[PDB]
Structure formats: C-alpha cells, structure tokens
C-alpha cells in the first residue's frame, strides 16, 4: 500500500529458473513493467492462432500489481503463457514459436519460448 518509486524493483536477475507445466511457455527475458491490457491483447492474439480442439492457453496473472495505475513488475525468467495439450499433439519449436509470435509484439519486453519441463537457462541466456 502506497509504495514508493523504489519498490518491487524488477531490475535484479533472479535465481529461480521457472518450471513450466504446459507443453510450451513464454518467458520474460528482460526487466520491465507490463500492463494488464497488454497481456490481454497478447492472450487474444495467441488464441487466434491456437487449435482450440487440442490446446489450452494458461496465463500466469497471480503476480503482484504495482502502482504507477496498476501494472506488473517483471524480473527475468518469469513465465507468462503456457500451451497445454488436451491430446497427443506435439508441436515443433518452429510451430510453438510461430504461435507465440502473434502475442510477442503486444508485450513491451523481450520474451523467449521455452519447451516443457524446467527452463534450461544456460541455453536460453
């Protein structure tokens, strides 16, 4: 409540390499602040490119909102979206990245597409 300009500073690089439960995931590569509306735009743009018969888009919104207006302060490596399978459909990297490519522009900071399991942050970074 009534937090100062220096609070929840995203600028540090985190030690937590996230674990993405979904088959694919979209992960924050830099520091920044993201508006909710931007993530909604991203979500809709991604849902345009998904085969809704085999797939479900999971958005991680549970992070704190910080006053500016309320937005998110994102550290490197924080997961955003998850492509979760309802069936045996196994995407390639080109396909998954082609899917997240729609929603990348709306997000103001750089993002990486990461495959199922734990982020291998030697390869990502």
């Amino acid at each position: 409540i009534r937090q100062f300009r220096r609070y929840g500073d995203p600028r540090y690089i985190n030690n937590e390499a996230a674990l993405i439960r979904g088959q694919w995931g979209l992960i924050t590569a830099d520091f920044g602040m993201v508006t909710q509306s931007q993530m909604e735009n991203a979500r809709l743009a991604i849902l345009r490119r998904l085969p809704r018969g085999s797939f479900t888009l999971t958005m991680h919104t549970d992070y704190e909102e910080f006053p500016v207006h309320f937005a998110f302060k994102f550290t490197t490596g924080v997961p955003l979206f998850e492509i979760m399978p309802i069936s045996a459909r196994r995407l390639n990297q080109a396909e998954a990245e082609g899917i997240f490519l729609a929603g990348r522009p709306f997000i103001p900071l750089q993002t990486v597409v990461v495959p199922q399991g734990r982020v291998d942050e030697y390869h990502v970074f």
Partner: peptide, 9 residues
C-alpha cells in the same frame, strides 16, 4: 544428465 534444453533436431 539433465535433458539438454535445446529442441533436438
């Protein structure tokens, strides 16, 4: 071994 994190092409 940890699985290597690249996409295996």
């Amino acid at each position: 071994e940890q699985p290597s994190g690249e996409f295996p092409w």
